[PDB]
């Protein structure tokens, strides 16, 4: 009779963490993704590494 009450409190905190997590995630990721490419060099910094692919993969 005790256990079921406990599982609810734990279960709610889990469920709420995900229900924030996706919405927080979408809200963050939709915010900062809007920037970024103004630094084209998020693009270059990889052409850098992508070149360290183009070299260092073969």
């Amino acid at each position: 009779e005790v256990k079921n009450r406990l599982d609810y409190h734990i279960s709610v905190q889990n469920m709420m963490r995900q229900k924030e997590q996706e919405h927080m995630i979408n809200w963050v990721e939709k915010r900062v993704v809007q920037s970024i490419s103004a630094q084209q060099e998020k693009e270059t910094i990889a052409k850098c590494i992508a070149d360290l692919k183009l070299l260092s993969k073969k």
């Binding site: 005790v2 256990k3 406990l6 409190h9 734990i10 709610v12 905190q13």
Partner: protein, 121 residues
């Protein structure tokens, strides 16, 4: 409490049926079995509880701590006799069987044996 542990001889019991307790016997088998086979299966305790680790992961806190202390400090009730005069009601009816009935009966029985001797002879 416990369990009565005791012995059942089924052709003995069932046949006995002194009218004022007879009925019980026929029913009494079936009643007993219910308890017998059931209890054999179940466990007597459940799991146990690590309140600390669960508590740390709860967010409505201090409640689990309340319940925890109260549970560990707590004792549940017990269940108790309506009847331990039945225990004794036996020895009285056992007086009935033996002394009262035994003796007068015994005397008759013996005599017939000796009687039979001579009436074989």
């Amino acid at each position: 409490r416990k369990l009565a542990l005791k012995t059942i001889d089924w052709v003995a019991f069932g046949e006995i049926i002194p009218r004022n307790q007879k009925a019980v016997a026929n029913s009494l088998k079936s009643w007993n079995e219910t308890l017998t086979s059931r209890l054999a299966t179940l466990p007597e305790k459940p799991p146990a509880i690590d309140w600390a680790y669960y508590k740390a992961n709860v967010a409505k806190a201090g409640l689990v701590d309340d319940f925890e202390k109260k549970f560990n400090a707590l004792k549940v009730p017990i269940p108790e006799d309506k009847y331990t005069a039945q225990v004794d009601a036996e020895e009285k009816e056992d007086v009935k069987s033996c002394a009262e009935f035994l003796t007068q009966s015994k005397t008759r029985i013996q005599e017939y044996e000796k009687e039979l001797e001579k009436m074989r002879n």
